[PDB]
């Protein structure tokens, strides 16, 4: 019933998204569609890490648009729509409707949680997050890791040298 | 003098310590358990399962009483 | 100890002038009130040994501050011992008035008598400065002890003769002490 | 996590039943046309707030936000130290923390970690 | 000369390379007490493991005492 | 999942909600009497009986004073955001620790730096919709602030979880059975405080909202209820930094009253750096938070590394 | 000090290790006897529905077997969806959501 009502606010929240011309419109909706598809992402695995790391990054993000928001295009008009409203409105009850009287079993994820998996499974007895994020620091897959070191220090680079400190602050007519 | 700032702290020291003591008592009045089962590890909400299977009180326990004479 | 970069003349104190220490035992010693902050905890112990202390509060109004026998108030009229009001109508006091908060207006009383018919004062032109008590021959005119005389209305605030009469009748034991004990200052 | 989102559900409504609360038992005064002005110290404000704000710490902010990913690739390795090889764990960990150290002394360096003025 | 500067300006940062060189000879120091001994084939095992005695894996099983 | 589970959840998380808020109402007093005391002067004592009723004083003004309606600000995101923060200041004390089974939290960290990052999310959309520039100025304070803090906070934090080997902060209780990690981590300790304050935005970093840099930050266009709710928001967040305080660095334990009169101590603490320290600049916190304790913290993670790698093979 | 607590917490954890090891073999074993007694029932209740449905065979997607390569007599372990195929929705929730509500 919870994942039927994320897939309706996902759905309300997109089309809200499609069309809102001002950027903190923009924020404000991919706010609320971040916390929506953090939680669902969530039902899918066993634990619940992935969810926090991807709120961490799509946090970490946006409170740097803000700034890009007041240094360029600060001033700029809301237009509120009846249409829009009456639109999101409609959908949205008749998709609370639809889930209500929908079949649970039928549209539930058939990606296995924690419970889903059997007791046979002695995998499924360690500590939560153990096995899944295991492969990141294990033999095989270490060198990927490496790289990745070494592409985030190449992207701090790339920043530095296209980002000139030295020619001044940026703004709107600078 | 300086005594006056303890009235003030010991209300943040006794209210604090509410949420903790009243559940030490409001499990008690219920479940009957001071402690409900904790939920950290697969192993102990398996187990959970086993115990609401067997009885609709999860919390209650079945002892040697349950097991027949043979 | 740490050196001078300029060398002080006789009578002069100059501050921000000592060398900074490049010795081990002085770098040690600065980086370890960086690291693990020495200033701040001394401070914080400067402010706990402070806690402990007795406060300076008064409990108003039960409490009241220390005042002087000179302190300027409330202007207030007085009396004669005999009972006949002091003030001439010699308008020194308000030729002394540096804001022009007092209007006098007189004329001949009926025993001949050279009185008022208007002592007005201004209390919210006045500065509470004490010039028409100093200036008063006859020591009419004074500063009363009252200072809790804050009024709801502006009206109030400018006194009529008659309610300077009613202060120097209210206020006069505090008065006539403040003159006894101040008379040979001035 | 169900009875979390239902306990922030009540959360927020309590919080909106206590700020309408607020609203409803306000003193309600007629609104006077420069008393909803902003307040600019007590005069005229001469520009709108919505006025583009210079920045002088993007690239401060853009390494902020490498920092941050790069955090989000640290906070694994508490669990895989117990079910891992050890030289493999100590490689990628020392190897990990040392080149965020390089860069960041790096940056120090050449005094990209100063606001630009 | 430059150790001198680095500890007069910025002694946190001295202070932490001693910490992390600290760390790196002790994280040497486990790495070799771990493989000096048969630190893979732990005493106490995840899951509930049984071997055949005709396994290979059987006679590395440790018989310590608790 | 039993029944009653579900009523004693809610029930003891409505129970903490009303504790926390009059908790709040009485840490307001605490500030007002002891930060007096900080100075030569008194608290509050005329009101009530001893000036105990005093945040009732202060609580029922600023519910019937006049709401501001503004004039150029979006009041329909004025309206909402001191609710949003003070939901989510209210919301992150789920994560508390209880011996019994308030909730099953097995990643509380990250759910503390996902609270604390969207409570100062509260703070820039508060600072942004009033309008004003002082308003706009202190957000965008809070917003360097945040970038400051946020990498820092979340290290330091990965170093305390590494002496523990997992996020659950109930096993801060097992590992601190003999003593308490304040003999191991005073260097953090410090930095820990130093960190909290800036999460809570209380001196000396309190660029987000500044009496004399600014006037009142972001809170210049707000009076009457949101000013209550952003108030109550901020000391939510300083009563839960001073419970992480007393949960990573001393006794985790909840069935002694020793852990609430330490917890009244580091709010005492929190109290008593604001009284003696004065307010840096937000550029010398950038200088700061970025040169110095990330550095730190990258480095005592290379100790704790080693240490754990140490300490693995002795067992 | 820590690293005598730490010695103590892995003896209290090891402890709590043998208790699930120990406890484990008769809880998979009632678990494997109510499995193939409610698989027997799911093959049961899936003839007796499919009847009237003609191409429908029991335990084959309209003839064609689900799993090639394999022995005659093996069994693969069924998905959850089909371990629950015949149930209302709080089985599903009874069983899926445990770890989501507590
Ligand atoms: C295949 C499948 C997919 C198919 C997809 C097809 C559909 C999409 C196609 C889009 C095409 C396109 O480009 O369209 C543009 C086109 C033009 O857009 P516009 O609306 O004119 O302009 C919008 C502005 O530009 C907007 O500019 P702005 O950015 O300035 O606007 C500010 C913005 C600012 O918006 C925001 O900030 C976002 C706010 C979102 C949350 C709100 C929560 C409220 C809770 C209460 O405000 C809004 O967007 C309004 C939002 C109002 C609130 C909505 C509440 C319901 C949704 C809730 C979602 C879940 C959140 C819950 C809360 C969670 C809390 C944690 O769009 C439309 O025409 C819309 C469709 C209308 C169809 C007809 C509707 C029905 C008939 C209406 C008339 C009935 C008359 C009856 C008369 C009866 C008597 C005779
Ligand atoms: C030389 O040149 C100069 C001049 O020229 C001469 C000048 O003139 C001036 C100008 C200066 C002046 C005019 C005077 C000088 C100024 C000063 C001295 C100011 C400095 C002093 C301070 C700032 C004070 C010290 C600071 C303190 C004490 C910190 C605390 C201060 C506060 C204001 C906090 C109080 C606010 C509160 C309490 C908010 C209220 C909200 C609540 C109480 C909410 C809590 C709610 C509850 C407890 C209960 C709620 C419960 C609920 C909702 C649930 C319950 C439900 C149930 C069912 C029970 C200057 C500067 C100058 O330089
Ligand atoms: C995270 C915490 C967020 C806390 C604040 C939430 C604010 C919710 C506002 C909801 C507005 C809904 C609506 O209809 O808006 C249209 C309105 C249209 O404006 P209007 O003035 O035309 O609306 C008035 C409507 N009548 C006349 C009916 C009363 O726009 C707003 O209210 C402004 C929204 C601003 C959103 C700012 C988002 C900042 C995001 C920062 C991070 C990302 C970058
Ligand atoms: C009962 C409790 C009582 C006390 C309660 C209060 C606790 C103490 C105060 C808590 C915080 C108070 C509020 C925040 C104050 C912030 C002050 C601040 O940071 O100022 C910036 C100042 C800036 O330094 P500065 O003042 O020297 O500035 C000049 C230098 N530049 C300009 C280059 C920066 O201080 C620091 O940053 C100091 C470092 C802080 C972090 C500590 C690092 C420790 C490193 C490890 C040490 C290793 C030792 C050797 C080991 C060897 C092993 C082999
Ligand atoms: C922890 C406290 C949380 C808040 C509790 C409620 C507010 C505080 C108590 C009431 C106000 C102060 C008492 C008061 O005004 O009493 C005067 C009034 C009586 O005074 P009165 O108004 O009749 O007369 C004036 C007083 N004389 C005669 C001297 C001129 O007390 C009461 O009416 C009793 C009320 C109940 C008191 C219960 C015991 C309180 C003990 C101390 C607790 C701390
Ligand atoms: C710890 C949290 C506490 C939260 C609550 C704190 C306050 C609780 C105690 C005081 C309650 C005051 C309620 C009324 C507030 C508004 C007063 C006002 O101006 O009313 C004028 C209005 C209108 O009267 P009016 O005719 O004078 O108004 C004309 C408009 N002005 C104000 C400009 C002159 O009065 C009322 O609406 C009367 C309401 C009576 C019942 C109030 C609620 C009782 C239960 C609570
Ligand atoms: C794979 C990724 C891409 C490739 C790698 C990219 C990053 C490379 C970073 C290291 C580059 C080294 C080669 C360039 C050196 C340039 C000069 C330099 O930095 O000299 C070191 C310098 C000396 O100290 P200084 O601050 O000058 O003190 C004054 C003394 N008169 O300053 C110092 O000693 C402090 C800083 C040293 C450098 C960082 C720490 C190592
Ligand atoms: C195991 C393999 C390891 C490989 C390397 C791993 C990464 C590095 C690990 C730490 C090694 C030492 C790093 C020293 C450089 C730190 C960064 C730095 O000093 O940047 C230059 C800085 C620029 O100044 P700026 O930040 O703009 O502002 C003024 C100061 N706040 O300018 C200053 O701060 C001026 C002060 C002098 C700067 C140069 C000092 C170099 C000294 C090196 C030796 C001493 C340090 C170690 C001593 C203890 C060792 C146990
Ligand atoms: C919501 C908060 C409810 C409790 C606090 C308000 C009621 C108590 C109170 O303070 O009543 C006012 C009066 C005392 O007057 P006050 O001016 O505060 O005293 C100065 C001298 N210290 O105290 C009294 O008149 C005492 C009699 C009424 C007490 C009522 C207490 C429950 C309400
Ligand atoms: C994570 C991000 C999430 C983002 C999405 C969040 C969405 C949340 C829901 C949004 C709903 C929006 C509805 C808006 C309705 C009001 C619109 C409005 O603007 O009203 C204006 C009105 C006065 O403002 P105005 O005069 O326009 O002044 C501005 C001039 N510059 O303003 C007002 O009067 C202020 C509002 C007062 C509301 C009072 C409601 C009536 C009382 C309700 C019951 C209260 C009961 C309390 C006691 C309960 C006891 C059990
Ligand atoms: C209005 C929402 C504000 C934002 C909330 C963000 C919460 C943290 C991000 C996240 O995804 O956390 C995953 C966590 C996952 O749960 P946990 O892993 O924290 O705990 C297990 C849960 C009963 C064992 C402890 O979920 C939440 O925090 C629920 C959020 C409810 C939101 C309600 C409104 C839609
Ligand atoms: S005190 Fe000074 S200002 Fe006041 S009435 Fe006397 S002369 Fe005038
Ligand atoms: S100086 Fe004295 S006597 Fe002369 S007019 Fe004034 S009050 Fe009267």
Same mark, same amino acid.
């Given at each position: 019933? +919870? ?11 997109? +089309?809200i ?17 971040? +916390?929506?598809?953090?939680?669902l992402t ?10 926090y790391?991807?709120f ?7 409170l =740097?648009?803000?700034i890009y =928001?007041?240094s ?5 008009m809301?237009?509120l729509?009846m ?8 959908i ?12 649970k079993?039928?549209?539930?994820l058939?990606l296995m ?21 295991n ?9 990927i ?12 680079? =790339?920043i =530095? ?14 | 003098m ?6 003030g ?13 009243a559940?030490?008592?409001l ?5 009957g358990?001071?402690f409900?089962?904790?939920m ?15 009885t609709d ?9 349950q097991?027949?004479?043979? | 100890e ?7 003349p006789?009578?002069y104190?100059?501050?921000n ?10 770098i040690?010693?600065?980086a ?9 905890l001394?401070?914080?112990?400067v ?7 007795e406060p300076?509060t ?11 026998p000179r302190?300027r108030?409330?202007?207030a ?11 001439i ?11 022009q908060?007092i209007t006098?207006?007189?004329?001949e009383?009926?025993?001949?008598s ?7 004062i201004d209390?919210?032109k006045?500065?509470?400065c ?5 200036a ?7 500063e ?21 009469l009613?202060?120097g ?18 | 996590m ?5 306990i922030?559900?009540?959360?927020l ?8 609360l607020?609203? #409803? ?12 002005s ?17 920045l002088?710490?993007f690239?401060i902010?853009i390494?902020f936000? #490498?920092?941050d990913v790069? #955090?989000?690739?640290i ?11 050890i ?7 020392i ?13 120090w ?9 | 000369?430059l ?8 002694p946190?940062?001295?202070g932490?390379?001693?910490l992390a ?9 486990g ?6 001994? /048969?630190? /893979?084939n732990r005493?106490?095992?995840?899951g ?14 440790r018989? /310590?005492?608790? | ?9 809610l029930?003891g998380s409505?129970?903490?909600?009303? !504790? ?11 500030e ?9 002067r008194?608290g509050?004592?005329?009101? @009530?009986?001893? @000036?105990?009723?005093?945040?009732? !004083? ?13 004039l150029?600000?979006?009041?329909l995101?004025? $309206? ?18 209880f011996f ?7 990643? @509380?960290?990250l ?5 604390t990052?969207?409570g100062?999310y ?13 308003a706009?100025l202190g @957000?965008?304070?809070a917003?360097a602030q945040?970038?400051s803090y ?7 934090l990965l170093?305390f979880?590494f ?13 601190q059975?003999?003593?308490?990690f304040l003999?191991?981590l005073?260097p ?5 405080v130093?960190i ?7 001196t000396?970093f309190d ?16 009076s ?11 000391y939510?967040?300083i009563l839960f930094?001073?419970?992480?305080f ?8 909840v069935?002694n009253?020793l852990?609430?009169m330490?917890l ?15 307010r840096?600049? $937000?550029?010398?916190?950038? $200088?700061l ?16 590394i ?9 067992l | ?10 003896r ?8 699930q090891?120990?406890?484990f073999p008769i809880?998979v ?5 109510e ?8 093959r049961?209740?899936?003839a ?7 191409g429908?065979?029991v ?6 077997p689900?799993?090639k390569?394999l022995?005659e007599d093996?069994?693969?372990?069924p ?15 009874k ?8």
């Amino acid at each position: 019933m +919870i994942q039927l009502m994320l897939y309706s606010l996902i759905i309300t929240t997109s +089309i809200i998204f499609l069309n809102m011309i001002h950027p903190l419109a923009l924020g404000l909706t991919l706010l609320i569609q971040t +916390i929506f598809v953090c939680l669902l992402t969530g039902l899918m695995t066993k634990s619940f890490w992935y969810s926090y790391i991807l709120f961490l990054i799509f946090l970490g993000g946006m409170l =740097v648009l803000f700034i890009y =928001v007041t240094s360029l295009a600060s001033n700029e008009m809301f237009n509120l729509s009846m249409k829009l409203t009456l639109f999101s409105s409609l959908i949205l009850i008749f998709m609370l409707i639809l889930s209500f009287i929908m079949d649970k079993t039928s549209s539930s994820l058939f990606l296995m949680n924690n419970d889903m998996q059997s007791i046979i499974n002695m995998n499924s007895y360690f500590m939560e997050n153990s096995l899944s994020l295991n492969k990141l620091y294990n033999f095989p897959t270490n060198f990927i890791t490496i790289l990745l070191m070494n592409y985030l220090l190449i992207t701090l680079i =790339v920043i =530095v040298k296209i980002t000139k400190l030295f020619k001044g602050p940026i703004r709107m007519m600078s | 003098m300086w005594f006056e700032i303890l009235p003030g702290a010991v209300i943040i020291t006794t209210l604090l310590s509410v949420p903790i003591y009243a559940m030490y008592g409001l499990d008690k009045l219920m479940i009957g358990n001071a402690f409900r089962r904790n939920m950290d590890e697969r192993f102990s909400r398996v187990m959970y399962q086993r115990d609401f299977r067997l009885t609709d009180n999860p919390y209650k326990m079945n002892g040697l009483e349950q097991i027949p004479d043979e | 100890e740490p050196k001078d970069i300029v060398e002080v003349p006789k009578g002069y104190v100059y501050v921000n002038n000592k060398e900074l220490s490049m010795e081990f035992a002085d770098i040690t010693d600065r980086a370890a009130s960086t690291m693990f902050f020495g200033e701040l905890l001394r401070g914080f112990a400067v402010t706990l040994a402070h806690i402990f202390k007795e406060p300076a509060t008064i409990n108003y109004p039960f409490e009241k501050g220390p005042l002087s026998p000179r302190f300027r108030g409330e202007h207030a009229l007085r009396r004669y011992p005999s009972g006949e009001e002091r003030c001439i109508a010699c308008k020194l006091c308000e030729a002394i008035c540096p804001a022009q908060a007092i209007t006098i207006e007189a004329e001949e009383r009926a025993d001949g008598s050279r009185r008022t018919t208007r002592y007005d004062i201004d209390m919210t032109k006045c500065i509470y400065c004490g010039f028409c008590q100093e200036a008063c021959p006859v020591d009419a005119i004074v500063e009363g002890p009252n200072f809790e005389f804050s009024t709801e209305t502006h009206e109030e605030l400018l006194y009529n003769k008659e309610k300077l009469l009613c202060n120097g009748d209210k206020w006069e034991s505090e008065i006539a002490s403040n003159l006894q004990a101040d008379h040979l200052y001035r | 996590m169900f009875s979390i989102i239902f306990i922030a559900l009540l959360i927020l409504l309590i919080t909106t039943i206590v700020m309408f609360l607020a609203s #409803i038992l306000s003193k309600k005064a007629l609104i006077d046309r420069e008393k909803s002005s902003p307040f600019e110290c007590g005069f005229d404000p001469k520009s709108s707030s919505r006025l583009p704000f210079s920045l002088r710490f993007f690239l401060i902010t853009i390494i902020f936000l #490498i920092f941050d990913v790069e #955090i989000a690739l640290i906070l694994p390795m508490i669990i895989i130290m117990k079910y891992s090889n050890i030289m493999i764990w100590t490689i990628t960990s020392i190897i990990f923390i040392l080149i965020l150290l390089i860069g960041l002394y790096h940056e120090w360096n050449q005094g990209m970690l100063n606001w630009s003025n | 000369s430059l150790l001198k500067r680095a500890w007069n300006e910025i002694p946190d940062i001295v202070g932490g390379s001693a910490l992390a060189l600290a760390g790196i000879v002790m994280a040497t120091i486990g790495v070799a007490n771990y493989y000096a001994k /048969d630190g /893979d084939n732990r005493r106490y095992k995840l899951g509930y493991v049984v071997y055949r005695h005709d396994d290979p894996r059987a006679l590395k099983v440790r018989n /310590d005492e608790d | 999942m039993f029944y009653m589970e579900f009523i004693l959840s809610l029930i003891g998380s409505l129970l903490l909600i009303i !504790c926390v808020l009059v908790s709040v109402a009485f840490l307001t007093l605490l500030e007002r009497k002891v930060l007096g005391y900080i100075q030569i002067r008194k608290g509050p004592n005329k009101v @009530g009986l001893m @000036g105990i009723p005093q945040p009732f !004083c202060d609580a029922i003004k600023l519910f019937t004073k006049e709401q501001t309606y503004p004039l150029l600000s979006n009041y329909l995101s004025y $309206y909402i955001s001191p609710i949003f923060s003070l939901f989510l200041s209210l919301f992150v004390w789920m994560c508390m620790p209880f011996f019994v089974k308030l909730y099953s939290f097995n990643l @509380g960290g990250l759910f503390f730096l996902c609270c604390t990052s969207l409570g100062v999310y509260t703070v820039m959309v508060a600072g942004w919709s009033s309008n004003s520039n002082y308003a706009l100025l202190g @957000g965008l304070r809070a917003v360097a602030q945040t970038i400051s803090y946020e990498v820092s906070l979340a290290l330091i934090l990965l170093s305390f979880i590494f002496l523990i080997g997992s996020y659950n902060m109930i096993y801060f209780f097992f590992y601190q059975v003999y003593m308490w990690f304040l003999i191991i981590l005073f260097p953090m300790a410090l930095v820990w405080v130093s960190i909290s304050l800036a999460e809570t935005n209380r001196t000396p970093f309190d660029f987000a909202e500044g009496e004399s840099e600014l006037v009142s930050g972001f809170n210049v266009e707000y009076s009457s209820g949101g000013f209550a709710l952003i108030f109550m928001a901020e000391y939510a967040s300083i009563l839960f930094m001073s419970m992480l305080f007393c949960v990573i660095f001393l006794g985790c334990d909840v069935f002694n009253l020793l852990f609430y009169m330490k917890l009244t101590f580091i709010s005492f603490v929190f109290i008593w750096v604001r009284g003696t320290l004065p307010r840096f600049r $937000y550029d010398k916190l950038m $200088y700061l938070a970025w040169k110095c304790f990330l550095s730190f913290s990258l480095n005592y993670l290379l100790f704790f590394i080693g240490f754990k790698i140490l300490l693995f093979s002795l067992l | 000090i820590y690293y005598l607590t730490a010695k103590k917490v892995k003896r209290d954890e090891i402890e709590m290790r043998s208790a699930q090891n120990v406890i484990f073999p008769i809880l998979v074993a009632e678990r494997d006897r109510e499995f193939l007694r409610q698989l027997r029932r799911n093959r049961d209740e899936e003839a007796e529905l499919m009847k009237n449905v003609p191409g429908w065979e029991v335990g084959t997607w309209y003839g064609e077997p689900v799993f090639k390569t394999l022995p005659e007599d093996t069994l693969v372990t069924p998905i959850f969806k089909e371990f629950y195929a015949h149930s209302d929705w709080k089985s599903y929730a009874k069983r899926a959501h445990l770890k989501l509500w507590s």
